Coordinates of C-alpha atoms in Angstrom, one line a residue:
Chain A
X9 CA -48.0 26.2 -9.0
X10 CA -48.6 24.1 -5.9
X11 CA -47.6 21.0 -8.1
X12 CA -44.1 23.1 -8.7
X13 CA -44.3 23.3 -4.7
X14 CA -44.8 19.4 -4.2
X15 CA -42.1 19.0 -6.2
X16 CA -39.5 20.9 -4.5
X17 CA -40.5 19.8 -1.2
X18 CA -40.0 15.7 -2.6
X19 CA -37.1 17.0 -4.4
X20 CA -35.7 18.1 -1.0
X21 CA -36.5 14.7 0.9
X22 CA -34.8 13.0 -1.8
X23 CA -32.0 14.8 -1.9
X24 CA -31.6 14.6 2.2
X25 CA -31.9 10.7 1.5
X26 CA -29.3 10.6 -0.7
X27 CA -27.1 13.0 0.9
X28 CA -27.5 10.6 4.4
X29 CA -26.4 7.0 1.9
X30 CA -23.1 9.2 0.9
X31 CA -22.4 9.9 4.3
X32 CA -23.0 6.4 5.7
X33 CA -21.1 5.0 2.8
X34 CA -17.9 7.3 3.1
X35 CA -17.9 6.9 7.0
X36 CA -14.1 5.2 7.8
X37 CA -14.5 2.0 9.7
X38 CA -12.7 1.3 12.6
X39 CA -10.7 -2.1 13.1
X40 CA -11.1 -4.5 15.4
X41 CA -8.2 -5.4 17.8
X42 CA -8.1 -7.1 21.4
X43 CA -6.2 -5.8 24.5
X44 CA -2.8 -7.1 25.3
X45 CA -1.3 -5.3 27.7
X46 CA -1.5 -2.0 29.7
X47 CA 1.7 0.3 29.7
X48 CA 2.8 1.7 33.4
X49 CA 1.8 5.5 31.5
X50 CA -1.3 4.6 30.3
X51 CA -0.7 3.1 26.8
X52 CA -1.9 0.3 26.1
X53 CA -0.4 -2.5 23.6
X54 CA -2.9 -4.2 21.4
X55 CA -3.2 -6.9 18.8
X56 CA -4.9 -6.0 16.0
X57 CA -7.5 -7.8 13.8
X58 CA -4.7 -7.3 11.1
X59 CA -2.3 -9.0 12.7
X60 CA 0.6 -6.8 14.1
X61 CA 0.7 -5.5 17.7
X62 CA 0.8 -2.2 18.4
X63 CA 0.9 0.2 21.6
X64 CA -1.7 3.0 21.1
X65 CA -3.4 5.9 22.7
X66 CA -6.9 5.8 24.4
X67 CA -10.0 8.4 23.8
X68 CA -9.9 10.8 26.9
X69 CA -14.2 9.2 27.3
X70 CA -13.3 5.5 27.8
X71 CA -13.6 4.3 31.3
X72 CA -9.7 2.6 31.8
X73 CA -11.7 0.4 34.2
X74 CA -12.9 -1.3 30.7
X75 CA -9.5 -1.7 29.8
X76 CA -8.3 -5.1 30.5
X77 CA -6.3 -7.6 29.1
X78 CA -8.5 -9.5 26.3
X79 CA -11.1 -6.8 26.4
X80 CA -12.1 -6.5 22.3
X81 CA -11.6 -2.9 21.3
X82 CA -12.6 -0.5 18.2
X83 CA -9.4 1.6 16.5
X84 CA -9.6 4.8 14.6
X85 CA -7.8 3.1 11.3
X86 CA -5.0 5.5 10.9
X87 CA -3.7 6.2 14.2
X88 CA -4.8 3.0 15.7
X89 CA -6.2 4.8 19.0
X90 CA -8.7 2.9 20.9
X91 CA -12.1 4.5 20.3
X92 CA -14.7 1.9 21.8
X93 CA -14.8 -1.4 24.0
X94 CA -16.4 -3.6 22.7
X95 CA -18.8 -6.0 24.2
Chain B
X9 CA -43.1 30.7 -10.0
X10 CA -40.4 31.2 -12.0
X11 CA -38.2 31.1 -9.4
X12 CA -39.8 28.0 -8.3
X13 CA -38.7 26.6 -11.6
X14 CA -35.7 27.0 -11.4
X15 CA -35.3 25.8 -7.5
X16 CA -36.7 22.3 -9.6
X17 CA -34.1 22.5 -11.8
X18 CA -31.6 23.3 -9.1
X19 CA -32.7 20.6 -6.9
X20 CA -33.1 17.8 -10.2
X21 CA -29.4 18.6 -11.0
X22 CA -28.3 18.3 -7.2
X23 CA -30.3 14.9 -7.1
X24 CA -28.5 13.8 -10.1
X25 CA -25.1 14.5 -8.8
X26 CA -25.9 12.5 -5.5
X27 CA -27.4 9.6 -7.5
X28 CA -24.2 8.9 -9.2
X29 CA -21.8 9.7 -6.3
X30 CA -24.4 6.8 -4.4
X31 CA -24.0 4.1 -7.3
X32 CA -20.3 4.7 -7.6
X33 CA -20.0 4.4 -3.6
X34 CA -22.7 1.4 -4.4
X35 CA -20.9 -0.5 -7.5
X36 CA -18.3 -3.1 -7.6
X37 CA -15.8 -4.2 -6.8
X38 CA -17.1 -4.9 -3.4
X39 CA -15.4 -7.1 -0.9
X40 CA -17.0 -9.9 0.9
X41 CA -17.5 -10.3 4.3
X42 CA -19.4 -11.7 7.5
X43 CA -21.3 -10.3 9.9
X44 CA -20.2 -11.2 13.7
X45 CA -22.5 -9.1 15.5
X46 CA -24.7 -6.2 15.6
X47 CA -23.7 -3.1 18.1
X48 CA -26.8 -1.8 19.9
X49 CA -26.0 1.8 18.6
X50 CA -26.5 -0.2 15.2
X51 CA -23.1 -0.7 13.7
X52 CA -22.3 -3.5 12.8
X53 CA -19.1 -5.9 13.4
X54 CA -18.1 -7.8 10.2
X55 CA -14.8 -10.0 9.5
X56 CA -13.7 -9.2 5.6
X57 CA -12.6 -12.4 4.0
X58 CA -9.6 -10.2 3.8
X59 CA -8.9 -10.9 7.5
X60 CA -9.0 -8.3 9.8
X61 CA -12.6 -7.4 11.3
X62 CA -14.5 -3.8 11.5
X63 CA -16.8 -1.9 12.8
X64 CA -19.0 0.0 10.1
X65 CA -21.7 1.5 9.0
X66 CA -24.4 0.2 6.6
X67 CA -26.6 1.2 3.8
X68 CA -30.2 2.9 5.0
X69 CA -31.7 0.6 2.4
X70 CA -30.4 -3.0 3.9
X71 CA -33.6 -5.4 5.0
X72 CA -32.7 -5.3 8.9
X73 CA -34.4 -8.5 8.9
X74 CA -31.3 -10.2 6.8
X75 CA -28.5 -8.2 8.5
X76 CA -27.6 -10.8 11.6
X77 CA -24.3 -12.8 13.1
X78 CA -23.1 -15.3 10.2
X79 CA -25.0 -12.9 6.9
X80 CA -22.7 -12.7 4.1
X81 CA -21.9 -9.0 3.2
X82 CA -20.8 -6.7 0.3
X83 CA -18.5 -3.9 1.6
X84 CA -17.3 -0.8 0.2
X85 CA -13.8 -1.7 -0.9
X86 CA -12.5 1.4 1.0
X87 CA -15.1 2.1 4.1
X88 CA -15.9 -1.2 4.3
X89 CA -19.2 0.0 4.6
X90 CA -22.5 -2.8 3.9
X91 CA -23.6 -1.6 0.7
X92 CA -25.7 -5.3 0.9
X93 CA -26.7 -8.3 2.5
X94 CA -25.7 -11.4 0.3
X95 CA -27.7 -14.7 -0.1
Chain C
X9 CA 24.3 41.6 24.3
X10 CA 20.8 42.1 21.9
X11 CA 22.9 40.4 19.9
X12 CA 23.0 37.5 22.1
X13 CA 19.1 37.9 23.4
X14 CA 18.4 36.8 19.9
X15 CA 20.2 34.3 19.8
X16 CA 19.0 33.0 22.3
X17 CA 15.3 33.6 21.0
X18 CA 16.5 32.1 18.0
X19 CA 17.6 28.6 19.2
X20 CA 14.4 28.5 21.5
X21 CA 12.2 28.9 18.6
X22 CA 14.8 26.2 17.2
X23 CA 14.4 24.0 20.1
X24 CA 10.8 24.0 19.9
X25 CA 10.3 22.9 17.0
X26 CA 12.7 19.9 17.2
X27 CA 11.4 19.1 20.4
X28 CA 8.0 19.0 18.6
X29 CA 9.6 16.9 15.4
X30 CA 10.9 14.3 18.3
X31 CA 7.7 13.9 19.6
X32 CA 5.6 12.7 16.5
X33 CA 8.6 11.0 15.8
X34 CA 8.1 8.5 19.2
X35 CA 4.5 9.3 19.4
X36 CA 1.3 6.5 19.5
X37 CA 1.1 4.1 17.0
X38 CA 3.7 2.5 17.5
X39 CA 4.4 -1.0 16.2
X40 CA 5.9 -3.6 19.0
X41 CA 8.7 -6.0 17.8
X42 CA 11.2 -8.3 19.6
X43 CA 15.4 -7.8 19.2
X44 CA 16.7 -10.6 17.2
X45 CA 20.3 -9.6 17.6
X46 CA 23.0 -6.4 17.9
X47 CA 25.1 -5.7 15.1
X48 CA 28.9 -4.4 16.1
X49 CA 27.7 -0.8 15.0
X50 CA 25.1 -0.6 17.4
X51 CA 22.6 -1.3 14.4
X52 CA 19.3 -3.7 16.0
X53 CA 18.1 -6.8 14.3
X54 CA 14.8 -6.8 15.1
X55 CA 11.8 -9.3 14.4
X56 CA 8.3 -6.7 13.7
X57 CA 4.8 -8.4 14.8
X58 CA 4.0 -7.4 11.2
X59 CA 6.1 -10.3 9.9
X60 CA 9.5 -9.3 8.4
X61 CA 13.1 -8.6 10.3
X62 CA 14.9 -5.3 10.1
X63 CA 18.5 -3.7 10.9
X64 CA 17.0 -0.9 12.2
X65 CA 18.4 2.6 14.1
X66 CA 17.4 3.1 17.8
X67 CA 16.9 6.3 19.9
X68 CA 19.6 7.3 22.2
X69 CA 17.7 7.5 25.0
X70 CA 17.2 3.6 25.4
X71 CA 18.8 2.1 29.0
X72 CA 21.5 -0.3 26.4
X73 CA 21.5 -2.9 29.7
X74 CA 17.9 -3.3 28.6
X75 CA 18.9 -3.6 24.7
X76 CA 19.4 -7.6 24.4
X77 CA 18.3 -10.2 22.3
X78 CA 14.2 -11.3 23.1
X79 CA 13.5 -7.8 24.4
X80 CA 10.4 -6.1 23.2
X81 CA 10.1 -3.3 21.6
X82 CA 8.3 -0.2 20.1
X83 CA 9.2 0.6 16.8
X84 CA 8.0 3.9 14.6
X85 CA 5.9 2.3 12.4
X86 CA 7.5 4.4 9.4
X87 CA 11.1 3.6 9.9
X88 CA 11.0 1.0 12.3
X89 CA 13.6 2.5 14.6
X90 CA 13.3 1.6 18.5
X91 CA 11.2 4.4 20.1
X92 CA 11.2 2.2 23.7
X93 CA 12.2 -1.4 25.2
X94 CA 9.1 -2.6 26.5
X95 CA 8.7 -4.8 29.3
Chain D
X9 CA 25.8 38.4 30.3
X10 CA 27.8 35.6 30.8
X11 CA 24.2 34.0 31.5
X12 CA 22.8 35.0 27.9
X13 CA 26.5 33.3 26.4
X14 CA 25.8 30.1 28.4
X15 CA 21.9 29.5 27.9
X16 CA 23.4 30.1 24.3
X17 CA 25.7 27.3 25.2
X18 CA 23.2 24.7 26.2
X19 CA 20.6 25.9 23.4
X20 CA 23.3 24.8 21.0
X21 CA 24.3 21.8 23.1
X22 CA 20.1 20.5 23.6
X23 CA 19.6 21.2 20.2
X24 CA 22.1 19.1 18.6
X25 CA 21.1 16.2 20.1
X26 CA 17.7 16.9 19.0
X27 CA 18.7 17.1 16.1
X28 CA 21.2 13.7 16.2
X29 CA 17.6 12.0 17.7
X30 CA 15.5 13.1 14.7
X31 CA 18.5 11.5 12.3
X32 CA 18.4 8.5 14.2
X33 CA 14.3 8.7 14.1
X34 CA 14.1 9.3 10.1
X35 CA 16.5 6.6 8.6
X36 CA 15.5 3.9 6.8
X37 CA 15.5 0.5 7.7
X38 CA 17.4 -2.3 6.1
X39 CA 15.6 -5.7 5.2
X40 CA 16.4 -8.9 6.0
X41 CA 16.1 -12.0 4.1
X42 CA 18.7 -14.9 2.6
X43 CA 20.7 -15.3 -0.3
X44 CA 19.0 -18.3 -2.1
X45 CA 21.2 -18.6 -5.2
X46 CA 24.0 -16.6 -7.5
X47 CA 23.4 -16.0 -10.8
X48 CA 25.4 -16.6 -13.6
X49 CA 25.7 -12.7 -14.2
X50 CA 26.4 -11.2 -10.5
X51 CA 22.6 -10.8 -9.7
X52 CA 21.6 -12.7 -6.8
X53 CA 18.3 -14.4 -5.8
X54 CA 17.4 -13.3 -1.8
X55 CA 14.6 -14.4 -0.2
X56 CA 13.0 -11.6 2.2
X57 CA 12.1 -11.7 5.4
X58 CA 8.7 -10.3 3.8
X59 CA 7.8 -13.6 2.2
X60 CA 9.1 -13.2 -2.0
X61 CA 11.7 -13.8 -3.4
X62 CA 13.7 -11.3 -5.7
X63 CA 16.5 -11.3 -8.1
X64 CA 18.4 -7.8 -6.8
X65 CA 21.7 -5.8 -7.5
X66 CA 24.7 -6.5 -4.8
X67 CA 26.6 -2.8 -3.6
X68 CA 30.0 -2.3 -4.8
X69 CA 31.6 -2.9 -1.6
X70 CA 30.6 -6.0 -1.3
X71 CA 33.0 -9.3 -0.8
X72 CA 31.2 -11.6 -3.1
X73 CA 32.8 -14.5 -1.3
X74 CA 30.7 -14.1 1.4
X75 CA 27.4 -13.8 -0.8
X76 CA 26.3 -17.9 -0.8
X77 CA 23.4 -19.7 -0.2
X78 CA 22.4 -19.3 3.4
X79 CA 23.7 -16.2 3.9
X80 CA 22.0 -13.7 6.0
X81 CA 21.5 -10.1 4.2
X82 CA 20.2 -6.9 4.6
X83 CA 18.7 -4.9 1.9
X84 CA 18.1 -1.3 0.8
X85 CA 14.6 -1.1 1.5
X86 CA 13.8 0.6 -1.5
X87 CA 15.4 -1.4 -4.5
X88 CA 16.3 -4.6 -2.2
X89 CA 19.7 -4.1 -3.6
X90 CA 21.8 -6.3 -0.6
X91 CA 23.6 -3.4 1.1
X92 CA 25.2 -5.6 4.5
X93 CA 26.2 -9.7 4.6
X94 CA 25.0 -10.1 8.1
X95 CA 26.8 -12.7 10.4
Chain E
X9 CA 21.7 14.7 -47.0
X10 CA 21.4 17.3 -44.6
X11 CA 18.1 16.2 -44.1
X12 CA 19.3 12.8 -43.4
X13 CA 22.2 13.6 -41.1
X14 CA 19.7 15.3 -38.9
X15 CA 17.1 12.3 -38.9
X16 CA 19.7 10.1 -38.1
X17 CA 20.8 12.3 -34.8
X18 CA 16.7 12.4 -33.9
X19 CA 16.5 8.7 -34.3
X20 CA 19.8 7.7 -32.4
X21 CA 18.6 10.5 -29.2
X22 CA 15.5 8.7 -29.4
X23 CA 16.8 5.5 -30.1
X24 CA 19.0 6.2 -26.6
X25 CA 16.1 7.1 -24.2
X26 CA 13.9 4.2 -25.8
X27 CA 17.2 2.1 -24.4
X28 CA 17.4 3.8 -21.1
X29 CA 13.3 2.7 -20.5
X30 CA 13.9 -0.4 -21.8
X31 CA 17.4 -0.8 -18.9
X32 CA 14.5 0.7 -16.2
X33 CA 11.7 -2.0 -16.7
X34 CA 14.2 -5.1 -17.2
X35 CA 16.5 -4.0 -14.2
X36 CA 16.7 -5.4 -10.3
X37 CA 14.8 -5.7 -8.4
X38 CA 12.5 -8.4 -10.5
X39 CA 10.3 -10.5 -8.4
X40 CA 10.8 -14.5 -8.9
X41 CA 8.0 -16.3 -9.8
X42 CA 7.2 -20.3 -11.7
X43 CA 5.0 -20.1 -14.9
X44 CA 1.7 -22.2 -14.6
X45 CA 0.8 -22.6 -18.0
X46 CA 0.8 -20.6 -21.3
X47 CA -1.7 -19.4 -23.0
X48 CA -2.8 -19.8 -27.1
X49 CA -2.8 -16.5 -27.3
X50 CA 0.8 -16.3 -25.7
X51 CA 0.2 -14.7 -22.3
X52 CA 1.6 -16.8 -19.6
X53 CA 0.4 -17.5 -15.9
X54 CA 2.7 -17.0 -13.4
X55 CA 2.8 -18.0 -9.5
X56 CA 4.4 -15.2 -7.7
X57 CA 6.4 -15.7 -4.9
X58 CA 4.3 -13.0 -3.5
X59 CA 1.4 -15.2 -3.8
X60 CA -1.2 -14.7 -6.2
X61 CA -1.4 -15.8 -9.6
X62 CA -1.2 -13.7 -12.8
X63 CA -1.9 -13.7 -16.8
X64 CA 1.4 -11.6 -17.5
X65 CA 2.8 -10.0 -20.6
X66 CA 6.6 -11.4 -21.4
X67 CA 9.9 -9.5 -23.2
X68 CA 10.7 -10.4 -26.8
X69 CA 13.9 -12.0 -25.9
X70 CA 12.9 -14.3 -24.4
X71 CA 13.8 -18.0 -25.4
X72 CA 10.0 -19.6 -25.9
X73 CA 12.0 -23.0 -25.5
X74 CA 13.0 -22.4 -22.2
X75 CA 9.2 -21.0 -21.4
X76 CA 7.3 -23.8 -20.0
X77 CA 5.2 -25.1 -17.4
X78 CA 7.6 -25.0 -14.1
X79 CA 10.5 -22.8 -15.0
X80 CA 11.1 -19.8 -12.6
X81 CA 11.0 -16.8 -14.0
X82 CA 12.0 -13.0 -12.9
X83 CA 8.9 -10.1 -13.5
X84 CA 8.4 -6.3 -13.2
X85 CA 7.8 -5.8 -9.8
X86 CA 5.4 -3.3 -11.0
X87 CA 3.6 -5.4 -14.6
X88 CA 4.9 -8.7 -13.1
X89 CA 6.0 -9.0 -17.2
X90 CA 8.3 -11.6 -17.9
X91 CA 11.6 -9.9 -18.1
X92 CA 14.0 -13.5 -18.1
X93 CA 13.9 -17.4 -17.4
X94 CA 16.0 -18.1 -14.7
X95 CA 17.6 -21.6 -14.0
Chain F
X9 CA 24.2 9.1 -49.1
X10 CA 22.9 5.8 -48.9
X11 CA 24.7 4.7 -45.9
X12 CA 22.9 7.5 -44.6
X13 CA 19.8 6.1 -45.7
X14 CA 20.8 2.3 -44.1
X15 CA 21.2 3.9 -41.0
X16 CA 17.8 5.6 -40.5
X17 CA 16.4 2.7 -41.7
X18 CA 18.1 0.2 -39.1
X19 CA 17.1 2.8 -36.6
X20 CA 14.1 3.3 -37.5
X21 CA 13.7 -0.5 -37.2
X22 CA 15.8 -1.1 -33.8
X23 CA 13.4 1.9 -32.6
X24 CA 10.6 0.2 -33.6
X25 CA 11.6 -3.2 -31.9
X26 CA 12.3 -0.9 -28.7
X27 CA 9.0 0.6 -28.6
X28 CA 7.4 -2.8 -28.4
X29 CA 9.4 -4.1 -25.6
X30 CA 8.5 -1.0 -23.7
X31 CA 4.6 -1.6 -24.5
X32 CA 5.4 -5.2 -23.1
X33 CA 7.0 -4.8 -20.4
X34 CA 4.6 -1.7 -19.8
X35 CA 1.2 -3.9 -20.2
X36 CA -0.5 -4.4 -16.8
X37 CA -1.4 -8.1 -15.7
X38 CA -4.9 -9.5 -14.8
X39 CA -5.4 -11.4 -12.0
X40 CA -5.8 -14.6 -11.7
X41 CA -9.0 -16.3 -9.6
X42 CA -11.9 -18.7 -9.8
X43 CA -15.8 -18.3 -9.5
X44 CA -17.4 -18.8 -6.5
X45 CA -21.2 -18.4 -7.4
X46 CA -23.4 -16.1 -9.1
X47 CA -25.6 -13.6 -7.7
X48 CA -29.5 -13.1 -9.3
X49 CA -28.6 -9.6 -10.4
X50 CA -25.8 -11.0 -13.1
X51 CA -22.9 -10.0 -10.6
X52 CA -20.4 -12.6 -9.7
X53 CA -18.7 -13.7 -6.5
X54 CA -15.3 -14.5 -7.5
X55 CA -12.4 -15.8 -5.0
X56 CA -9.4 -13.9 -6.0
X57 CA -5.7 -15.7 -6.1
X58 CA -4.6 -13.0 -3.7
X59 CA -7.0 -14.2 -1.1
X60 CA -10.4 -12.3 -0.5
X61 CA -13.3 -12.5 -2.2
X62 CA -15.0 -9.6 -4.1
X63 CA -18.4 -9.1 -6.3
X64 CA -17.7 -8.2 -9.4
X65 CA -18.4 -7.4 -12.6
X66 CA -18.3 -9.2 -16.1
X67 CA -17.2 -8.2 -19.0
X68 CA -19.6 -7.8 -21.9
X69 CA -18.1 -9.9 -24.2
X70 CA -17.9 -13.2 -21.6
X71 CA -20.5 -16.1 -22.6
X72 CA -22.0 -16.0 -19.2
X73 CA -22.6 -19.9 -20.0
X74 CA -19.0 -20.6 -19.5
X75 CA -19.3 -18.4 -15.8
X76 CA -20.1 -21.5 -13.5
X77 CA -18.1 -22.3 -9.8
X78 CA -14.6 -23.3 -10.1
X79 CA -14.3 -21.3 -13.2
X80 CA -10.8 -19.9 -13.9
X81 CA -11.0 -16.5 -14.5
X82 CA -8.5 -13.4 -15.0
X83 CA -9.4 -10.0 -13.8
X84 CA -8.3 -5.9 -14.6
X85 CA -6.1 -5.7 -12.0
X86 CA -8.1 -2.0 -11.0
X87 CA -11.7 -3.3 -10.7
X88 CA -11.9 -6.9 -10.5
X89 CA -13.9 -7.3 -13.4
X90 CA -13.9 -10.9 -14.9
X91 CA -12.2 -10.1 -18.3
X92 CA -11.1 -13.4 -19.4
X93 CA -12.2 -17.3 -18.4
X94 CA -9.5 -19.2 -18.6
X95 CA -9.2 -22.4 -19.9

């Protein structure tokens, strides 16, 4: 009775474990470029880890201050937008 | 009691679905890469040996102790996700 | 007179939409090539940062005086068409 | 009333040239590489811009005395068929 | 007699679209690759032009004399099977 | 009568022939790379002709003695796994 208990409550951690590994493991990356250049309307044209150039949005949170030629940025990998600076 | 039963059963099947969908995210073909460096929110910055470089996420069940600039990596093929730390 | 006042409604609604078809059309990401040469049709050469060349459509909204061979441009990343002369 | 037949006017006017834009936006591109070599049986080898090389169809229209090694092509994007001889 | 009139109608339509598959995977655009070496058990490695390096399936008309280390051939863009030798 | 029966046998014979050029042309290739080292756990690092390198697995029926560095090996196209060492 209290063992059935036991069991549901490991049963539950378990299952919160494995449920935190999927959505860790399915999380999109986001691809490394470096800043190039900044546009006169606020996009900016960046080279991408992949190769290409490309001239992007910005998140509405990052500080254009940051935003400098050679500054290394983080992409979201399908519409390129800049998401983080990078140390 | 019954109903406790069956919240095993419920759970045991659950846990068994989430097992497999962890070893398929888990199992080759995984890509190599390299870590460059370690973000302080705990991502990680790796360069795939198919180029480009990422920021991602990592298994919960890496040895931290292994996971620094220069470690060899295993990557989910599509998040690019460290699913290991290679020797 | 109604007649016309939804008409009128009509090719708003029409405009809209187009307007809003234009603008994913030019939008962020947009890949950044250089002109190779002009074609007698009015057809672009260009040279993409991903590697290959292209005969490639532009908008009709590009300053031609700017149109020339080394300019830089942004292409849609689909068709390749030039979206913009960058400086 | 005259007003309603007029916006109707420029409606018509504005959204035609949408409408020429998003033509302009959604055609493919052509590729460029060079004619390597003519086969004994009309195919020809090109090498693309993209880096292979391909054995592809020639259009119709083409003047086949301009088709000779060296010569600058572009290609239906699709089935590399060589749709223009460039100059 | 019947019988056999019919048959010969169901193996001639089938007979026609086995033709038209056949036209499909031999036809432009073939990618041109070099063979490497052949195999005992008649499989053949090829050098794209693309790049990498295959173990490739090969048509039946093919001339095995002409099938050697060093000869160019032309491959399924899709299989990379060896559809002809070239010169 | 017994042209009849000549012609579904030819047919039946060209249709035949046709049916195998379609399974060859149809086969997919392996890919074509070379061992890199062996991890603890029986998985192997293999460097793949198209660039990257990837864990992988083996097939079952591979003498694992013949798996050492520098080892040609040809892979399913899909999951990387080592299906063939080469010679």
């Amino acid at each position: 009775m209290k063992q059935l208990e036991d069991k549901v409550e490991e049963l539950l951690s378990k299952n919160y474990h494995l449920e935190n590994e999927v959505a860790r493991l399915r999380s999109p990356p986001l691809l490394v470029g470096v800043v190039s250049d900044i546009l006169e309307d606020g996009r900016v044209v960046v080279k991408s880890s992949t190769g290409p150039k490309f001239v992007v949005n910005t998140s509405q949170y990052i500080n254009e201050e940051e935003l400098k030629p050679g500054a290394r940025v983080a992409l979201n990998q399908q519409t390129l937008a800049i998401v983080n600076v990078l140390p």
